[PDB]
């Protein structure tokens, strides 16, 4: 019922919007459509301490699409800093995003996420990722594509915000489900191939 504003920052192309979309709808977006300014998305989770609601401010990473930039960070109560383990430049910029972020939000829990660990030609080695130690950030290797650790950022932030180390995600109860010219709409569906037919699932 009570909600928390979360700001999501990082270089362009690191996967911020794809990460949020995976949590909203479960889809994986392959296209890169740069965010223009910011997009706000309600994101609820069901926990043993009741439901928790995140108002996710998914900001733009490209400079020329930045919009209000640090104006988006006002009143934020948590944040995720995103980079791309296949792009060293995005890690080198983490200190810049963190700087602009903590100048508005002096004492908020922040997660550092290295995305795209599913790609085997990794460039930002695990040993290199240390910026979070002195800055009291939590770090996770994640993959929005494989879902690797994709829940960890929100579970940790929910534990910090609610103030409960034993907070866990729980199963939302499932109520009893209820009890034309689709021939065309279904024909299109059958003849449109499913994506990633070589995945294990």
């Amino acid at each position: 019922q009570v909600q928390f504003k979360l700001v999501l920052v990082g270089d362009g192309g690191t996967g911020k919007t794809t990460f949020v979309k995976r949590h909203l709808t479960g889809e994986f977006e392959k296209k890169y459509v740069a965010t223009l300014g910011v997009e706000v998305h309600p994101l609820v989770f069901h926990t043993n301490r009741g439901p928790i609601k995140f108002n996710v401010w998914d900001t733009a990473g490209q400079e020329k699409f930045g919009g209000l930039r640090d104006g988006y960070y006002i009143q934020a109560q948590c944040a995720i800093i995103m980079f791309d383990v296949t792009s060293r430049v995005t890690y080198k910029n983490v200190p810049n995003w963190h700087r602009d972020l903590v100048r508005v939000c002096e004492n908020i829990p922040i997660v550092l996420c290295g995305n795209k660990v599913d790609i085997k030609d990794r460039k930002v080695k695990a040993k290199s990722i240390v910026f979070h130690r002195k800055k009291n950030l939590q770090y996770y290797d994640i993959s929005a594509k494989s879902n690797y650790n994709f829940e960890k950022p929100f579970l940790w932030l929910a534990r910090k915000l609610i103030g409960d180390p034993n907070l866990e995600f729980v199963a939302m109860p499932a109520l009893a489900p209820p009890e034309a010219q689709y021939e065309h709409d279904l024909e299109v569906a059958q003849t449109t191939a499913l994506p990633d037919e070589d995945d294990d699932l």
Partner: protein, 1015 residues
């Protein structure tokens, strides 16, 4: 909508309407919020928006409105400050300064509007970077003076000074020219002595705490660059290490300040600075023991509870102890009176290492590696840490993470199952735990064995029996392989196996038996040295793995296959020789049962098995015997292959036949991967028919696309047919990349291969072309390209133009073809550049277009190769000397490469390739300034006769930059090119001048003298 009213600037600005858009954006939701967002963006990005900044400030009540007003000033100050009249500059300075004072004097505002105040301070600091000190020499004295007035002003001045320090020393490299960064550093440096006095007086004459915290926060930044004397020649270390550690609201920042001090390489000679470095550490550890927790405290439990800032403080404590001790622990290791301090600090780290927090554990694990590595070499040191190292052995062993080889895990239901995905993010942690535990074992091998044996003993009798306890113990036992003596290893391994064997027999359950199975497999797989010396045991192990290949538990079955090949990679030799009391080499027993051994395995597991056999076979160096073994190993897939061929020669459509063919090829790939050059006899057995099959399936794919459309490529049938073509290509690529007899490759393989693949690739529709063809041709050109000059030409004709048309409409389609394409052009340009000299002028133009096309990718895989091709092409052309083709190339393409390299240097969208862009540009400029280009680069009319290409190059570039960046002055451009030209032999300075230019194009009024920084 009515919210768009603020976008019209003819009318005055209705501030009330502004606050509604702001509120609708920050506190709204849905479509209203989305509409207000787009409005505020348009308002903020209006070049005149700044003129209404003071207006918004004064008469607006919403602080978010004023924040966005300052964001408009910051943007103006950063990029267009020097484009303003001198009056608009002082005015802006005035109501920024006046605003800060106005907010700090209202105690209510100062308490509640910390966001707007900090933003205003940051805005002021942007003015300082522009105006200070040359046009504001009294800012610091006036700042110091005003601090003694209001306690709120003094505190806020610490914020301003903190931000100024950050912008000058911590974040200037990317945002300023070298010259301006140096100017501001020297300026702050020249005036710091006064800054320090104010900061030291505040700290000593304690005050509003929040002022003490602000002052310490500023000190943290100063410590990054200030001289050592300010630290050790004052009483400040005592203040930090005693006073400000007592109060918890100052303890966090104080500890971070002491961490920065700790990480200084101090003069190794001054005995007094060593005493001070010892003293502040002594004081700090004393304040923690008395004010926070004793060394015996359960930090694992404290962290888990997460009261207040306990987690942050425990992290900061870990950073302080590890930072200080890694640098200065030698200061504590001789003096007997300091022994207790040394051990108490390390005992805190022992307690910190028990916290359940991966990232924190890695931080402490890094220190432990630092320590045990020092104790492994440094004489007479390890005895000091004997008790510490014993506890650490226990911490590491009980916290071992699952190795990648262990494929079984417990799920949320309590069952042992196979792992969905790999645990990619624990691989590095395991390596680090192994490194430290291996060191700890070398330091006291007896203590490590006693721990592990007794821990094991309490698993048999069930004292501490659990899946977690047997797992971590097994993983630790396996991870220390190689540390003990052979004889100790024997007794040790023997003991471990016996009890793990007993433990299996002993335990009822599907799950217990799968856990103990994975653990036994990991341990035995980790001790090849032992297996080599005990043939009977090795045979037994292998036969047991064969039994596990029949188990219905997927995890155990898959792990048996990986353990098998893991053992083989290390013990292969003991499978090719005939061991004592054996009728034949064990490889013959494996081969003769391969069908029933692998009967229940999945196809890719069967292939792994064949690859393992291939490893063994390659140990036999008698050609007759190796070829015979190879022939035996391949007997099953060759019999199925021969059967398939007879049928194929009667017009494959069967989905089950396609799967069979694919697995035959995949088996040949698996064996070829491990046998390399030795695989040639098996390859020649199938080669000719294999390529005929490649042609046959190609016709099927084409016929399917024709009858069903492009969608056919998605069907399981067509995908199955293309798998065949891909595995065929992979098999040929695999062999050719390892072949040692290149004459046979050329005279036997290459000719039929090109005839089979090239025309098929060229004459298929784009969606039917396999990027694997490009990958195969790359290997062919890499290995024998120098022997088939006409073959390379044929490859270009077949794949160059049609592939380019696939990938030159955007940067996203056909990503594999994109990458493999430029890997192919790269190797051709390296090994067989003559093929490009034969290209008609039109096709050589596309080749240049293709290279520049690669520049503009953000994909590193394409970009790096694009810049490398351009570099190598320039070398290739330069080698040719003063001949017509080299002359024509420069006349046609020199300036195309200069301007294109410049475009990607300056567009801010290809930051990743700056280094190679710079290198490429440096080579092109140096060609002219070494008169390596023999003909003039200009036209008959453009320039007087006899004008050096140096002159024309500067004129061309000056004009290019003038039109591409019209906001630069002619002097900026002239100074830049003059500097850039003088430095075209010194890459480091060359790159500095380019970075200075990238800074200046982001603003107006850049100082042209900044380009003299090197001179």
């Amino acid at each position: 909508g009515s919210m768009e009213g603020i976008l019209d600037f003819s009318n005055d600005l209705d501030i009330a309407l502004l606050d509604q858009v702001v509120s609708t954006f920050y506190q709204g939701s849905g479509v209203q919020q989305k509409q207000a967002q787009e409005i505020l963006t348009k308002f903020q990005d209006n070049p005149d928006a700044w003129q209404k900044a003071d207006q918004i400030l004064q008469f607006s009540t919403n602080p978010q409105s004023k924040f966005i007003a300052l964001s408009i000033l910051d943007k103006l100050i950063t990029r267009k400050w020097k484009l303003l009249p001198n009056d608009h500059r002082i005015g802006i300075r005035n109501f920024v300064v006046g605003m800060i004072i106005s907010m700090c004097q209202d105690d209510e505002v100062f308490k509640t509007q910390k966001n707007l105040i900090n933003k205003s301070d940051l805005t002021l600091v942007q003015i300082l970077k522009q105006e200070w000190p040359q046009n504001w020499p009294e800012f610091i004295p006036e700042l110091i003076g005003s601090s003694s007035s209001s306690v709120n002003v003094c505190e806020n001045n610490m914020i301003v000074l903190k931000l100024l320090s950050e912008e000058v020393f911590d974040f200037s490299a990317e945002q300023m020219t070298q010259a301006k960064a140096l100017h501001l550093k020297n300026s702050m440096s020249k005036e710091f002595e006064q800054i320090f006095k104010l900061c030291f007086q505040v700290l000593e004459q304690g005050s509003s705490s929040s002022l003490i915290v602000a002052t310490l926060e500023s000190l943290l930044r100063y410590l990054h660059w200030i001289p050592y004397r300010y630290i050790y020649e004052t009483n400040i270390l005592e203040l930090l290490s005693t006073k400000f550690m007592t109060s918890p609201d100052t303890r966090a920042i104080t500890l971070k300040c002491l961490t920065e001090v700790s990480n200084l390489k101090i003069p190794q000679d001054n005995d007094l600075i060593k005493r001070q470095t010892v003293l502040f550490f002594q004081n700090t550890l004393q304040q923690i023991a008395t004010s926070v927790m004793p060394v015996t405290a359960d930090l694992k439990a404290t962290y888990a509870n997460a009261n207040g800032n306990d987690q942050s403080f425990l992290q900061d404590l870990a950073m302080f102890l590890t930072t200080y001790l890694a640098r200065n622990r030698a200061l504590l290791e001789s003096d007997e009176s300091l022994r207790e301090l040394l051990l108490n600090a390390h005992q805190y780290l022992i307690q910190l290492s028990k916290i359940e927090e991966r990232e924190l554990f890695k931080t402490t694990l890094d220190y432990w590696h630092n320590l045990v590595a020092d104790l492994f070499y440094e004489p007479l040191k390890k005895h000091i840490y004997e008790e510490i190292c014993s506890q650490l052995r226990l911490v590491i062993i009980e916290n071992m993470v699952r190795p990648e080889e262990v494929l079984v895990v417990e799920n949320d239901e309590g069952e042992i199952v196979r792992e969905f995905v790999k645990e990619s993010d624990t691989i590095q942690l395991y390596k680090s735990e192994r490194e430290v535990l291996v060191y700890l074992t070398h330091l006291n091998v007896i203590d490590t064995e006693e721990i592990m044996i007794s821990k094991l003993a309490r698993q048999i009798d069930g004292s501490e029996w659990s899946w977690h306890n047997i797992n971590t113990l097994s993983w630790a036992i396996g991870s220390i392989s190689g540390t003990m003596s052979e004889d100790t290893e024997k007794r040790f391994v023997v003991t471990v196996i016996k009890d793990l064997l007993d433990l299996c027999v002993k335990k009822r359950g599907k799950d217990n038996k799968a856990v103990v199975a994975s653990d036994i497999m990991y341990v035995v797989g980790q001790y090849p040295r032992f297996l080599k010396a005990h043939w009977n045991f090795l045979r037994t192990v292998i036969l047991k793995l064969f039994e596990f290949m029949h188990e219905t538990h997927e995890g155990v079955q898959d792990m048996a296959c990986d353990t098998f090949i893991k053992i083989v990679q290390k013990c292969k030799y003991h499978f090719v020789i005939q061991q004592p009391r054996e009728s034949e080499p064990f490889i013959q027993t494996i081969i003769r049962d391969i069908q029933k051994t692998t009967a229940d395995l999945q196809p890719q597991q069967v292939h792994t098995f064949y690859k393992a056999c291939g490893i063994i076979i390659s140990e036999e160096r008698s050609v007759a015997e190796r070829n015979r073994l190879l022939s035996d190993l391949m007997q099953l897939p060759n019999m199925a292959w021969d059967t398939i061929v007879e049928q194929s020669t009667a017009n494959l459509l069967d989905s089950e036949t396609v799967k069979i063919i694919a697995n035959i090829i995949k088996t040949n790939v698996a064996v070829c991967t491990s046998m390399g050059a030795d695989f040639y006899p098996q390859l020649g057995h199938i080669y000719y028919n294999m390529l005929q099959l490649y042609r046959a399936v190609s016709s099927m794919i084409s016929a399917q696309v024709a009858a069903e459309g492009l969608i056919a490529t998605k069907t399981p049938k067509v995908r199955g047919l293309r798998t065949i073509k891909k595995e065929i290509l992979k098999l040929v690529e695999t062999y050719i990349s390892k072949a040692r007899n290149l004459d046979d490759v050329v005279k036997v393989l290459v000719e039929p291969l090109l005839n089979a693949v090239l025309e098929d690739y060229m004459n298929n529709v784009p969606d039917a072309r396999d990027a694997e063809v490009l990958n195969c041709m790359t290997t062919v050109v890499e290995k024998v390209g120098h022997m088939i000059p006409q073959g390379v030409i044929l490859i270009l004709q077949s794949v160059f133009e049609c592939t380019l048309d696939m990938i030159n409409k955007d940067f996203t389609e056909y990503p594999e073809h994109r990458v493999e394409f430029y890997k192919l052009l790269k190797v051709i340009n390296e090994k067989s550049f003559a093929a490009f000299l034969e290209l008609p002028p039109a096709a050589f133009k596309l080749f240049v277009d293709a290279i520049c096309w690669a520049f503009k990718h953000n994909n590193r895989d394409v970009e790096v190769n694009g810049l490398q091709i351009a570099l190598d092409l320039v070398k290739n052309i330069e080698r040719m000397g003063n001949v017509p083709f080299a002359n024509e190339f420069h006349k046609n393409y020199f300036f195309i490469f200069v301007s294109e390299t410049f475009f990607v240097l300056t567009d801010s969208d290809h930051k990743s390739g700056f280094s190679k862009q710079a290198l490429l540009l440096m080579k092109l400029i140096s060609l002219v300034y070494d008169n390596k280009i023999s003909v003039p680069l200009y036209q008959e009319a453009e320039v007087p006769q006899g004008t050096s290409n140096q002159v024309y190059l500067s004129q061309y570039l000056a004009n290019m930059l003038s039109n591409a960046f019209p906001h630069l002055t002619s002097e900026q451009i002239a100074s830049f090119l003059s500097a850039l030209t003088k430095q075209c032999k010194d890459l480091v300075v060359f790159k500095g001048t380019l970075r200075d230019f990238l800074v200046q194009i982001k603003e107006v009024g850049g100082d042209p003298t900044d380009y003299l920084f090197a001179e």
